[PDB]
């Protein structure tokens, strides 16, 4: 894994020692080359994981996420170029360094073979994200959003640290391979119940769960474009990755303990999709849609069936791409009109035609038009839940309908109608923004042709 | 209440100074080379070369190997009259029941 890690680390000295003109160019070029290197990890032996070393391993679950992060870094730099132009060279380099540290931490989290190291790196991501949000946000609420994000995540995580240390003491090892191979069943005792809660709750917080999702809207709304992109695409997926990894330890109690979170996620998906219908801010609407899709992912993980896990992996990747693209599309309008109110900018299809097509494709993926990977994941999850209970179809179908409604309502309001007369600052879309949208869309559409890559280990 | 500079006007359009801005910077040369770097190293290299690399990635998932083994097993079992799939994953004798 050092083939990827070491170059990512060298990205920092290059960025710091690069000329003021050339920071973005060098960062983008070398990040893209690193992403190209990451594509080698997609080749996964079916039976066994790629155990590169004692510290690091990759499987059919970690590989797609690593590729996603490496891909995301250059898109994040491209998106963040515009609003950081006025910033001084040192601050721009610090922002790029925060992004690079975040990528390094995420890669090590995904490839780490020990749960304690995974915890250290997974919590470590808070610092760069917190710094980004609270230093390069454009609103007074960036500080409160940072406090909420940090404290929600830490309150979830710390009991996880206690539980992991206890597991290390009892089983004797926190290496995932040994844990999987031995994996003695849990007993239905209050102590084991609370251990299950401690293990699950941190990832339940990271993956916005209904009742623990309040941090996500504030953080995504108040964060800069790059921070929103990472939070939606990758940081949420850390919870899913950990929950899929951690579920091995808690085999039997999961059936008994799943019902509260299963019900919360299933009803919350409807609740948040309905929330999206009446939201007045584009970023907030995108965030709530993210919440709903991650609720679908949570249901898939809790059910603990192979098809559900494959759907969860596919949905994680597809949603990361789609939500990042949606945030970037909203950010372009925000830069042009300097407001996140949906009503303020209208009829943008006439003014900016190609951005309208980008919006259409992003919304279609959001509403799971087949054969999109979004639909593949959602359909697999839906079938697994149908096996879990035939009555599940009602809520899932209602959620599908509400998702289509809110996605196309966003598209109609922002990109359709008569243009807002007074707004005169709309200017022809730059090649950079269209290139960012295309870089988002094309990999998602291409991944449909070969869907085994994003279908996870159980495939 | 304070001596603060007037809010800067909306950042000057890069088009005004350079009509073919391409974005990516104020200086036109860096704009062109940034666009070229992005387009080459993502579209031409990562998407096309990377997509080809994924498409022809060697089948270490053993799908064809599994299919060939299944064909052999099906032919043998049908020829010998043995059931196509045995109900017991592991041989009963080795198991010692309580």
């Amino acid at each position: 894994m050092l083939k990827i890690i070491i170059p990512t680390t060298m990205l920092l000295p290059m960025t710091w020692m690069s000329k003021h003109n050339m920071i973005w160019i060098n960062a983008t070029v070398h990040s893209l080359l690193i992403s190209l290197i990451s594509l080698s990890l997609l080749n996964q032996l079916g039976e066994n994981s790629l155990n590169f070393s004692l510290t690091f391993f990759s499987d059919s679950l970690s590989a797609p996420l690593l590729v996603l992060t490496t891909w995301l870094l250059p898109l994040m730099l491209m998106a963040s170029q515009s609003h950081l132009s006025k910033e001084t060279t040192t601050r721009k380099k610090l922002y790029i360094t925060m992004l690079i540290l975040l990528q390094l931490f995420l890669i090590m989290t995904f490839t780490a073979t020990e749960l304690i190291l995974f915890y250290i790196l997974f919590e470590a991501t808070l610092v760069p994200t917190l710094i980004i949000i609270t230093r390069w946000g454009n609103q007074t609420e960036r500080l409160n959003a940072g406090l909420y994000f940090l404290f929600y995540t830490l309150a979830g995580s710390l009991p996880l640290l206690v539980a992991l240390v206890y597991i290390q003491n009892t089983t004797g090892s926190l290496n995932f391979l040994i844990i999987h191979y031995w994996s003695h069943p849990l007993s239905n005792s209050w102590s084991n119940i609370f251990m299950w809660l401690a293990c699950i709750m941190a990832f339940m917080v990271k993956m916005p769960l209904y009742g623990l999702h309040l941090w996500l809207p504030k953080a995504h709304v108040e964060a800069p474009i790059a921070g929103s992109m990472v939070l939606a695409a990758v940081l949420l997926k850390l919870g899913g990755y950990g929950m899929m990894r951690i579920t091995t330890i808690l085999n039997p109690l999961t059936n008994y303990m799943a019902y509260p979170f299963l019900m919360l996620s299933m009803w919350g998906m409807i609740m948040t999709s309905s929330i999206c219908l009446r939201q007045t801010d584009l970023k907030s609407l995108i965030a709530y849609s993210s919440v709903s899709h991650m609720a679908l992912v949570i249901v898939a993980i809790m059910i603990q069936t192979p098809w559900s896990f494959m759907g969860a992996t596919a949905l994680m990747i597809a949603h990361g791409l789609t939500s990042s693209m949606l945030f970037c599309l909203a950010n372009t309008n925000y830069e042009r009109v300097h407001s996140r109110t949906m009503i303020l900018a209208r009829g943008l299809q006439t003014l900016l035609p190609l951005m309208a097509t980008w919006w259409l494709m992003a919304s279609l993926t959001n509403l799971a038009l087949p054969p999109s990977i979004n639909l593949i994941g959602e359909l697999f999850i839906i079938t697994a839940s149908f096996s879990w209970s035939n009555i599940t179809i009602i809520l899932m179908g209602m959620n599908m309908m509400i998702t289509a409604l809110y996605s196309l309502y966003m598209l109609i309001t922002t990109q359709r109608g008569k243009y807002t007369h007074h707004i005169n600052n709309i200017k022809a879309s730059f090649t950079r923004e269209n290139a960012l949208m295309a870089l988002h869309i094309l990999p998602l559409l291409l991944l449909t042709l070969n869907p085994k890559m994003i279908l996870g280990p159980l495939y | 209440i304070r001596l603060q500079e007037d809010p800067d006007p909306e950042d000057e359009n890069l088009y005004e100074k350079n009509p073919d801005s391409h974005g990516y910077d104020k200086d036109p040369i860096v704009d062109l080379w940034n666009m070229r770097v992005v387009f080459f190293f993502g579209f031409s290299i990562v998407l096309v070369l990377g997509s080809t690399f994924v498409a022809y990635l060697p089948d270490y998932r053993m799908q064809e190997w599994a299919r060939r083994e299944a064909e052999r097993l099906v032919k043998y079992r049908e020829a010998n009259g043995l059931p196509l799939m045995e109900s017991n994953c592991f041989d009963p004798n080795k198991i010692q029941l309580p």
Binding site: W136, N138 | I1, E10
Partner: peptide, 14 residues
């Protein structure tokens, strides 16, 4: 528009 930075009223609360 520019990133909001603390005002005198915000500072006085501390």
């Amino acid at each position: 528009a520019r990133q909001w930075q603390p005002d005198v009223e915000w500072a006085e609360q501390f």
